């Protein structure tokens, strides 16, 4: 995200080639509990709101950059429930403009 315009090169089968987003996102929804990626740090660096589900053992450094914390244990039922509320809310908003 901080370097989303850097060039890419085709090599092989690899892990498949993918460029960055052409448009800067307005919100980032994170499902990372093991903290494998730097997405929270990059979004904090680039001033983007973050919706993420926080563990009881989250570090302060990662916590303070999260705009919308949802305190829970991310079980399969709660992940489904979260995504269901998000999808239903978004499509209900989309229908109000005739789309």
């Amino acid at each position: 995200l901080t370097n989303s315009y850097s060039p890419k090169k085709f090599r092989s089968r690899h892990k498949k080639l993918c460029f960055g987003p052409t448009t800067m996102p307005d919100c980032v929804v994170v499902f990372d509990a093991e903290r494998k990626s730097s997405v929270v740090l990059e979004a904090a660096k680039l001033q983007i709101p973050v919706v993420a589900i926080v563990d009881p053992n989250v570090p302060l450094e990662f916590f303070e950059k999260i705009t919308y914390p949802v305190p829970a244990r991310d079980s399969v039922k709660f992940v489904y429930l979260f995504c269901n509320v998000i999808t239903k809310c978004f499509v209900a908003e989309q229908m109000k403009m005739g789309i």
Binding site: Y5, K8, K9, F10, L17
Partner: protein, 417 residues
């Protein structure tokens, strides 16, 4: 303009007019008696009402002394306007932008007069209203000053005083907003090249989306394709990747902002030791500000002293802070803060004091827009730490509005009590 022949015509006509007025007045007085020793030898030769005759004798002899080109353009005497050094390209672009918008408004009017269905007329007037909301929209700040100026022409006494002060504050705020609106693309630049901007970005966006779809389609088939067909798909994918890299490089156009001032704080020569000698590079630290509360800084490293300043000039507009001032000339209260070993003290001052500061702090406060501040730097005087400590102090200041929000009380100036 006026032709030289026309300018000669008027002065010859005026001399003939004063001669004919003398002749007609002399005759009018002569016809009633009234000998004209006050018209003759008093209005023709020995009047000398200004003392112009020495200048006449000087200029008449000077006008023939040398020769050359009688039509040659020469430099202006009362020259040095000193503000007329304006890039004329934006001036000659905005005029035809407005001309095109006005012509489009006229065509919408001439379509609305030529419509035939009232449903179609409703559609056309909606189109006209959507046009006039985007190209001919008056900002809501102007109607407040409109009502106030309506009251001002009929108010008198104390009310004229109050209305004049309020409209003066409104004039300042509207002028500032118009000159530094970030939404208006006319407040941006091209920085040396290292409504057309929106469509220029849009066509690149559409080309990028098409290239992404084609790349996805070929990458979908590479897994099942084996052999020379796979090799030619690999070459086509590589060519598409080269094209998309070339398109995404073009979206990196740095922009500066008009009206901002950029100054150099530090240029240093740093060196790294290798087995072949010393590797010497350059770092430059630069600051920028718009005199209205927005201030920023950047640091960059290149190989040459010009390229370091160019890189920091490019990156100077990406880390911008807003600083609150008290009555647009001084800070709200005294503030002391430290960054590492650089301790910085700032004190406010009354309105006719001036700014008492060193080079780095004075440049930073001048670009931020302060006018009456005293300061002192105690400890280490590293320039980069001084820049950082000034930005810490200017952001640690609690405004009266901040005290009001923090405590839920009313904060009143003491002379308004």
């Amino acid at each position: 303009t006026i032709s030289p022949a026309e300018a000669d015509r008027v002065v010859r006509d005026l001399l003939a007019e004063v001669e004919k007025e003398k002749q007609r007045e002399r005759e009018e007085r002569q016809r009633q008696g009234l000998d004209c020793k006050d018209i003759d030898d008093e209005d023709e030769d020995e009047e000398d009402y200004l003392g112009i005759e020495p200048f006449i004798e000087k200029l008449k002899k000077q006008n023939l002394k040398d020769d050359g080109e009688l039509n040659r353009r020469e430099e202006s005497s009362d020259s040095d306007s000193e503000l007329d050094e304006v890039d004329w390209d934006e001036e000659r672009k905005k005029e035809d932008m407005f001309n095109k918008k006005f012509q489009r408004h006229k065509e919408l009017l001439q379509t609305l007069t030529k419509s035939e269905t009232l449903d179609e007329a409703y559609k056309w007037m909606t189109k006209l209203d959507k046009f006039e909301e985007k190209h001919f929209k008056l900002a809501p700040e102007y109607r407040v000053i409109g009502e106030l100026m309506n009251r001002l022409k009929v108010a008198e006494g104390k009310d004229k005083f109050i209305l004049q002060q309020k409209i003066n504050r409104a004039m300042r705020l509207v002028e500032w907003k118009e000159a530094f609106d970030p939404n208006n693309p006319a407040n941006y630049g091209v920085i040396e090249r290292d409504d057309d901007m929106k469509e220029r970005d849009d066509i690149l966006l559409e080309k990028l989306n098409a290239i992404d779809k084609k790349l996805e389609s070929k990458l979908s088939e590479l897994d099942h394709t084996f052999g020379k067909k796979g090799k030619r798909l690999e070459e086509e994918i590589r060519d598409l990747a080269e094209e998309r890299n070339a398109l995404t490089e073009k979206k990196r156009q740095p922009l500066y902002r008009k009206g901002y001032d950029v100054h150099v704080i530090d240029v240093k020569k740093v060196a790294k030791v290798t087995k072949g000698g010393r590797v010497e590079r350059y770092t430059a630290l630069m600051v920028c500000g718009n005199y209205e509360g927005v201030i920023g800084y950047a640091k960059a490293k290149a190989e040459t002293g010009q390229s370091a300043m160019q890189k920091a000039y490019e990156k100077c507009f990406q880390n911008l802070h807003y600083i609150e001032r008290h009555e647009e000339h001084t800070i709200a209260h005294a503030i002391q803060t430290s960054y590492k070993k650089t301790k910085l003290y700032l004190w406010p001052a009354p309105t006719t004091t001036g700014m008492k500061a060193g080079r780095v702090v004075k440049t930073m406060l001048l670009l931020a827009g302060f006018k009456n501040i005293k300061s002192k730097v105690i400890g280490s005087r590293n320039s980069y730490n001084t820049v950082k400590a000034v930005l810490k102090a200017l952001n640690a200041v609690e405004t009266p509005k901040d005290v009001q929000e923090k405590f839920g009380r009313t904060v009143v100036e003491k002379y308004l009590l």
